[PDB]
Scaffold this active site. Structure first.
Site, PDB file in Angstrom:
ATOM      1  N   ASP A 166       7.082  31.811 -40.063  1.00  0.00           N
ATOM      2  CA  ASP A 166       6.041  30.983 -39.463  1.00  0.00           C
ATOM      3  C   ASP A 166       6.410  30.725 -38.021  1.00  0.00           C
ATOM      4  O   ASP A 166       6.615  29.584 -37.575  1.00  0.00           O
ATOM      5  CB  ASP A 166       5.851  29.664 -40.208  1.00  0.00           C
ATOM      6  CG  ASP A 166       4.588  28.929 -39.779  1.00  0.00           C
ATOM      7  OD1 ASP A 166       3.598  29.592 -39.337  1.00  0.00           O
ATOM      8  OD2 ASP A 166       4.600  27.681 -39.894  1.00  0.00           O
ATOM      9  N   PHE A 219       2.810  21.278 -42.247  1.00  0.00           N
ATOM     10  CA  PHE A 219       4.104  20.682 -42.129  1.00  0.00           C
ATOM     11  C   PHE A 219       4.279  19.278 -42.703  1.00  0.00           C
ATOM     12  O   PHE A 219       5.401  18.792 -42.746  1.00  0.00           O
ATOM     13  CB  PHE A 219       4.512  20.705 -40.649  1.00  0.00           C
ATOM     14  CG  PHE A 219       3.701  19.796 -39.739  1.00  0.00           C
ATOM     15  CD1 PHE A 219       3.894  18.404 -39.733  1.00  0.00           C
ATOM     16  CD2 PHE A 219       2.825  20.342 -38.809  1.00  0.00           C
ATOM     17  CE1 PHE A 219       3.191  17.595 -38.854  1.00  0.00           C
ATOM     18  CE2 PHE A 219       2.127  19.529 -37.926  1.00  0.00           C
ATOM     19  CZ  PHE A 219       2.312  18.159 -37.940  1.00  0.00           C
ATOM     20  N   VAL A 257       3.593  15.283 -42.133  1.00  0.00           N
ATOM     21  CA  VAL A 257       3.367  14.360 -41.028  1.00  0.00           C
ATOM     22  C   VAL A 257       4.685  14.148 -40.289  1.00  0.00           C
ATOM     23  O   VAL A 257       5.727  14.034 -40.916  1.00  0.00           O
ATOM     24  CB  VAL A 257       2.821  13.011 -41.541  1.00  0.00           C
ATOM     25  CG1 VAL A 257       2.785  11.946 -40.445  1.00  0.00           C
ATOM     26  CG2 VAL A 257       1.420  13.219 -42.073  1.00  0.00           C
ATOM     27  N   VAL A 258       4.631  14.093 -38.963  1.00  0.00           N
ATOM     28  CA  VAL A 258       5.769  13.726 -38.166  1.00  0.00           C
ATOM     29  C   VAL A 258       5.498  12.395 -37.477  1.00  0.00           C
ATOM     30  O   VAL A 258       4.396  12.146 -37.005  1.00  0.00           O
ATOM     31  CB  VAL A 258       6.049  14.796 -37.124  1.00  0.00           C
ATOM     32  CG1 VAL A 258       7.173  14.354 -36.197  1.00  0.00           C
ATOM     33  CG2 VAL A 258       6.400  16.107 -37.815  1.00  0.00           C
ATOM     34  N   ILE A 260       2.906  11.348 -34.639  1.00  0.00           N
ATOM     35  CA  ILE A 260       2.800  12.409 -33.651  1.00  0.00           C
ATOM     36  C   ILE A 260       1.765  13.446 -34.070  1.00  0.00           C
ATOM     37  O   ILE A 260       1.198  14.083 -33.195  1.00  0.00           O
ATOM     38  CB  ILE A 260       4.150  13.120 -33.473  1.00  0.00           C
ATOM     39  CG1 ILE A 260       5.163  12.122 -32.925  1.00  0.00           C
ATOM     40  CG2 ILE A 260       4.023  14.376 -32.583  1.00  0.00           C
ATOM     41  CD1 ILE A 260       6.563  12.687 -32.845  1.00  0.00           C
ATOM     42  N   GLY A 261       1.553  13.667 -35.375  1.00  0.00           N
ATOM     43  CA  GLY A 261       0.565  14.664 -35.842  1.00  0.00           C
ATOM     44  C   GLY A 261       0.694  15.066 -37.299  1.00  0.00           C
ATOM     45  O   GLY A 261       1.712  14.807 -37.915  1.00  0.00           O
ATOM     46  N   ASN A 262      -0.364  15.664 -37.846  1.00  0.00           N
ATOM     47  CA  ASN A 262      -0.430  16.102 -39.250  1.00  0.00           C
ATOM     48  C   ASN A 262      -0.735  17.589 -39.334  1.00  0.00           C
ATOM     49  O   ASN A 262      -1.256  18.182 -38.371  1.00  0.00           O
ATOM     50  CB  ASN A 262      -1.521  15.355 -40.016  1.00  0.00           C
ATOM     51  CG  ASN A 262      -1.567  13.873 -39.687  1.00  0.00           C
ATOM     52  OD1 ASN A 262      -0.658  13.313 -39.069  1.00  0.00           O
ATOM     53  ND2 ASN A 262      -2.641  13.225 -40.105  1.00  0.00           N
ATOM     54  N   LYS A 301       9.974  13.915 -40.028  1.00  0.00           N
ATOM     55  CA  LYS A 301       9.080  14.791 -40.759  1.00  0.00           C
ATOM     56  C   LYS A 301       9.042  14.376 -42.226  1.00  0.00           C
ATOM     57  O   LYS A 301      10.064  14.369 -42.882  1.00  0.00           O
ATOM     58  CB  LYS A 301       9.565  16.227 -40.626  1.00  0.00           C
ATOM     59  CG  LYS A 301       8.615  17.250 -41.194  1.00  0.00           C
ATOM     60  CD  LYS A 301       9.174  18.640 -40.990  1.00  0.00           C
ATOM     61  CE  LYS A 301       8.237  19.659 -41.594  1.00  0.00           C
ATOM     62  NZ  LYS A 301       8.887  20.926 -41.977  1.00  0.00           N
TER      63      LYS A 301
HETATM   64  C1  LIG Z   1      -1.492  18.159 -35.026  1.00  0.00           C
HETATM   65  C2  LIG Z   1      -0.202  18.623 -34.387  1.00  0.00           C
HETATM   66  C3  LIG Z   1       0.237  19.905 -34.729  1.00  0.00           C
HETATM   67  N1  LIG Z   1       1.400  20.091 -34.053  1.00  0.00           N
HETATM   68  C4  LIG Z   1       1.632  18.944 -33.334  1.00  0.00           C
HETATM   69  C5  LIG Z   1       2.728  18.501 -32.394  1.00  0.00           C
HETATM   70  C6  LIG Z   1       2.396  17.898 -31.189  1.00  0.00           C
HETATM   71  N2  LIG Z   1       3.369  17.479 -30.356  1.00  0.00           N
HETATM   72  C7  LIG Z   1       4.678  17.643 -30.643  1.00  0.00           C
HETATM   73  N3  LIG Z   1       5.613  17.219 -29.767  1.00  0.00           N
HETATM   74  C8  LIG Z   1       7.037  17.247 -30.027  1.00  0.00           C
HETATM   75  C9  LIG Z   1       7.466  15.871 -30.555  1.00  0.00           C
HETATM   76  N4  LIG Z   1       8.814  15.893 -31.079  1.00  0.00           N
HETATM   77  C10 LIG Z   1       9.151  16.509 -32.239  1.00  0.00           C
HETATM   78  C11 LIG Z   1       8.211  16.995 -33.160  1.00  0.00           C
HETATM   79  C12 LIG Z   1       8.644  17.648 -34.308  1.00  0.00           C
HETATM   80  C13 LIG Z   1      10.002  17.843 -34.547  1.00  0.00           C
HETATM   81  C14 LIG Z   1      10.412  18.482 -35.614  1.00  0.00           C
HETATM   82  N5  LIG Z   1      10.762  19.085 -36.566  1.00  0.00           N
HETATM   83  C15 LIG Z   1      10.894  17.363 -33.593  1.00  0.00           C
HETATM   84  N6  LIG Z   1      10.469  16.720 -32.477  1.00  0.00           N
HETATM   85  N7  LIG Z   1       5.027  18.222 -31.794  1.00  0.00           N
HETATM   86  C16 LIG Z   1       4.099  18.653 -32.662  1.00  0.00           C
HETATM   87  C17 LIG Z   1       4.697  19.218 -33.885  1.00  0.00           C
HETATM   88  C18 LIG Z   1       5.420  20.396 -33.822  1.00  0.00           C
HETATM   89  C19 LIG Z   1       6.008  20.901 -34.984  1.00  0.00           C
HETATM   90  C20 LIG Z   1       5.882  20.214 -36.195  1.00  0.00           C
HETATM   91 CL1  LIG Z   1       6.640  20.816 -37.705  1.00  0.00          CL
HETATM   92  C21 LIG Z   1       5.168  19.032 -36.233  1.00  0.00           C
HETATM   93  C22 LIG Z   1       4.587  18.521 -35.085  1.00  0.00           C
HETATM   94 CL2  LIG Z   1       3.672  16.974 -35.185  1.00  0.00          CL
HETATM   95  N8  LIG Z   1       0.649  18.033 -33.527  1.00  0.00           N
END
Ligand SMILES: Cc1c[nH]c(-c2cnc(NCCNc3ccc(C#N)cn3)nc2-c2ccc(Cl)cc2Cl)n1
Ligand SMILES: Cc1c[nH]c(-c2cnc(NCCNc3ccc(C#N)cn3)nc2-c2ccc(Cl)cc2Cl)n1
Ligand SMILES: [Mg+2]
Ligand SMILES: [Mg+2]
Lengths: 347, 347
Positions: free
Chosen positions: B145, B31, B33-34, B26-28, B49
């Site tokens: 944060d 935090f 990587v998720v 989902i992204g880096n 995560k």
């Molecule tokens: C490069 C980048 C930076 N931020 C994101 C991003 C984009 N789309 C989504 N969608 C929600 C998906 N579901 C999720 C996602 C996370 C958790 C949890 N803890 C639960 N559920 N979430 C994030 C995101 C938001 C918070 C974090 Cl710590 C990490 C990510 Cl990857 N991508």
């Protein structure tokens, strides 16, 4: 004929006696914090120039112009003219154009998994160190040394420091803001909030740049504000009682994790020249007063190769100005002249 | 399909086998990587995560993640530990509820289409946020944060959930703490100033910034650099008073600020922005830590009263999410307010 802009602009040196300056061939270079920078060509001389256009707000003190007029050094970008423009008021500094940045040239070598030849590091770093020696001897601190603000001509090997939008005279006693430098090049005193800091924040940023030219990546790449102190402590090691005392005494009972410092030689890739390592260790110090002054750094053994009378650039050209010091420059420590200007370069 | 050994978050403290499948990134970020996966067991979508931690450091994310249960906070389902490359480090794999969208994504959507978010949803989202802050501030914990990127939400049910507790930490009166902390647009001013004695009031400031940005359509304090933060703030709040300065940090007592007069709050937002919302920010975005409301105090405010109306419904014709089911804990901050927060309508 093409589209010529003509404006009334005041010389950078001299007393406010405007003249008409025409330029042509305006291209945008880039865009950011610094404002907008255009490239253009002086119609008169044919010479190329950077025009830096800052949006300014009369409410705030905007010391960039004052300082740009104040100063004149071969390793710093020259103000030629400046002028005003039209929704509100815009400052237009007309500066020396220079074709590349260190950032980019370094990024090139990084993408090629290639080490930048040390001779260029020595050239580039030396010249930075003169530009600081100089601005610091007016007690002016740049407060944004980073690779993007180091311009260079690759063929001539000339480096020029640029972007004085955060620079400022630092006076003993006066407090100033400590959210200043870019993160990676931000010195640890500033991360601890300290308002009692000195010129030697720029020496920390310089060390961060040196390191980065030897690694081919930044030495302290904080993921976030907080990761930065981590990534620093992971190599510098945890600070003494008195290092914290010397940065900012509020942290004196903070309780950092105890990390052993990673010795310098294992930080750098294995064929790295000692004097590089040695210099690097004397710039990236916790205690700010322990860090070398810019002139002390120029006199380091890592730049000895440049004081060799036989030395040349890889492309066969002569080395640029390195020894044309003024008494301003050497005020910090004038006897160094003997090392700094070698005999063959002496008049 | 991968199968790992892992431990239920709430209980009991005892490893079990866990099989999940259809992983995809989902992204880096800071935090880690998720990934998204589906549990092979009960079919479900899940967020994995995975952070890299250095065992020499107080990595308080998982303890904090374990002592939380609350509707507007991500539930930690399982956790585990993969091995790291160097001997000093290891992977922590939190396995949480997958929420499908985020507030940063939904504001940056509604702001591409050159417009404001339905004022209902500003109401709904800030309420549920300010709720969870109330819940976590009550155990001493500060998120440190707060930003739209960290607020997950379901668009259908409108259920928002706080996430990323990587910077989260229990503040404790008298202790010093690291000033350089939140994401930059949302860093509370005292932190910019270097305050080592900041309270959980910072998270309220940060939530204040998010309130703004939903009604402004884009960030309220966008520094193009670090120095430009305190600028772009003073540009709205005007100069702080010697009392306000002293409240944030003793050391800037003597600092020569520009004299700037505040920018009237109704004059900051759109002319048709509800004045209850405006009153709210006025009380959230105050220089002085203490003069800022608490999150509980914020939930109980005119701006949110529309949510308490029995006839309220989601503009997609659905019922609302569970706004009123307060615990004793959530209310410890100030239990009188339960009079307002829970209306007659529930009970
Ligand atoms: C490069 C980048 C930076 N931020 C994101 C991003 C984009 N789309 C989504 N969608 C929600 C998906 N579901 C999720 C996602 C996370 C958790 C949890 N803890 C639960 N559920 N979430 C994030 C995101 C938001 C918070 C974090 Cl710590 C990490 C990510 Cl990857 N991508
Ligand atoms: C978005 C972005 C950020 N930095 C850049 C960028 C890219 N390429 C080059 N090349 C050197 C061009 N010549 C120049 C440029 C500036 C000055 C001066 N003062 C003199 N000469 N320079 C810059 C650059 C570097 C410093 C500043 Cl303050 C501004 C810019 Cl645009 N682009
Ligand atoms: Mg890191
Ligand atoms: Mg700005």
């Amino acid at each position: 004929g093409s589209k010529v802009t003509t404006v009334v602009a005041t010389p950078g040196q001299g007393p406010d006696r405007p003249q008409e300056v025409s330029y042509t061939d305006t291209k945008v270079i880039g865009n950011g914090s610094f404002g907008v920078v255009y490239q253009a060509k002086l119609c008169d001389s044919g010479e190329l120039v950077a025009i830096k256009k800052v949006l300014q707000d009369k409410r705030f003190k905007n010391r960039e112009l004052q300082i740009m007029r104040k100063l004149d050094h071969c390793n710093i970008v020259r103000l030629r003219y400046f002028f005003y423009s039209s929704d509100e008021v815009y400052l237009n500094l007309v500066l020396d154009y220079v074709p590349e940045t260190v950032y980019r040239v370094a990024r090139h070598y990084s993408r090629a998994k290639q080490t930048l030849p040390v001779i260029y590091v020595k050239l580039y770093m030396y010249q930075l160190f003169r530009s600081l020696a100089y601005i610091h001897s007016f007690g002016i601190c740049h407060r944004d040394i980073k690779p993007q603000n180091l311009l260079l001509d690759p063929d001539t090997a000339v480096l020029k420091l640029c972007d004085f939008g955060s620079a400022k005279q630092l006076v003993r006693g006066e407090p100033n803001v400590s959210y200043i430098c870019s993160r990676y090049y931000r010195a640890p005193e500033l991360i601890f909030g300290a308002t009692d800091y000195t010129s030697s924040i720029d020496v920390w940023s310089a060390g961060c740049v040196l390191a980065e030219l030897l690694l081919g990546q930044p030495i302290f790449p904080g993921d976030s504000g907080v990761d930065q102190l981590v990534e620093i402590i992971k190599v510098l090691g945890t600070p003494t009682r008195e290092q914290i005392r010397e940065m900012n005494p509020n942290y004196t009972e903070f309780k950092f994790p105890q990390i052993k410092a990673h010795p310098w030689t294992k930080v750098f890739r294995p064929r790295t020249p000692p004097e590089a390592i040695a210099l690097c260790s004397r710039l990236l110090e916790y205690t700010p007063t322990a860090r070398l002054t810019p002139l002390e750094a120029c006199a380091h053994s890592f730049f000895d190769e440049l004081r060799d009378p036989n030395v040349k650039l890889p492309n066969g050209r002569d080395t640029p100005a390195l020894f044309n010091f003024t008494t301003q420059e050497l005020s910090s420590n004038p006897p160094l002249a003997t090392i700094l200007i070698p005999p063959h370069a002496r008049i």
